[PDB]
């Protein structure tokens, strides 16, 4: 199945005998699920993201069914605002990003040009918006807060910003702030015709 990114790429997953909805997240190295009941032992762990860090319980060798496709791997359970399926599992179900096909064994990084500057960014299907690390940008902006795994961060919102992503031009909103990594969200991914295929 092929999926466009005009909407959040949600899928049905079965794990620990329970059915849930989760977000296919190319920007996530791992899989993190909201609090739930899982059998066996786990290991304390801290993961980072926008907003900061959160403590999670690490379950290894867990069987998970993502839209019918079976996979076994590590699942983190903690105070995440959204269930997300990270690359550790996306690779198991043959997930690829197309916009130029890209597998997910490595972070899907791209070169972008914005504000006359060159940078590297992460193609993030789990992000609604595009968020870049502090940088010099022309024009006016408006205060705005966005949430993430570790909480929220204050960012500067710039509209109608021209950005080139691996040669492809797009114009849209770009948020600049305390993000741990530059991420290209769905607002821009749709413009470069990005699709998820598995």
């Amino acid at each position: 199945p092929q999926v466009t990114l005009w909407q959040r790429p949600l899928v049905t997953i079965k794990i620990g005998g329970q059915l849930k909805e989760a977000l296919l997240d190319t920007g996530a190295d791992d899989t993190v699920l909201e609090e739930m009941s899982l059998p066996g032992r786990w290991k304390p762990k801290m993961i980072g993201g926008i907003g900061g860090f959160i403590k999670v319980r690490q379950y290894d060798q867990i069987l998970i069914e993502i839209c019918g496709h079976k996979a076994i791997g590590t699942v983190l359970v903690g105070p995440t605002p959204v269930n997300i399926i990270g690359r550790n599992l996306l690779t198991q179900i043959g997930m690829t990003l197309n916009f130029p096909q890209v597998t997910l064994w490595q972070r899907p990084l791209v070169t972008i040009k914005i504000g006359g500057q060159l940078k590297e960014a992460l193609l993030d299907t789990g992000a609604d918006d595009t968020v870049l690390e502090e940088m010099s940008l022309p024009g006016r902006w408006k205060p705005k807060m966005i949430g993430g795994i570790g909480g929220f961060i204050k960012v500067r919102q710039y509209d109608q910003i021209l950005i080139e992503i691996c040669g492809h031009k797009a114009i849209g909103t770009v948020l600049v702030g305390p993000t741990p990594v530059n991420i290209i969200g769905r607002n821009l991914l749709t413009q470069i015709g990005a699709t998820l295929n598995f």
Binding site: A28, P81, V82, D124, A127, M145, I183
Partner: peptide
């Protein structure tokens, strides 16, 4: 908000 949000972005993951």
């Amino acid at each position: 908000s949000q972005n993951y």
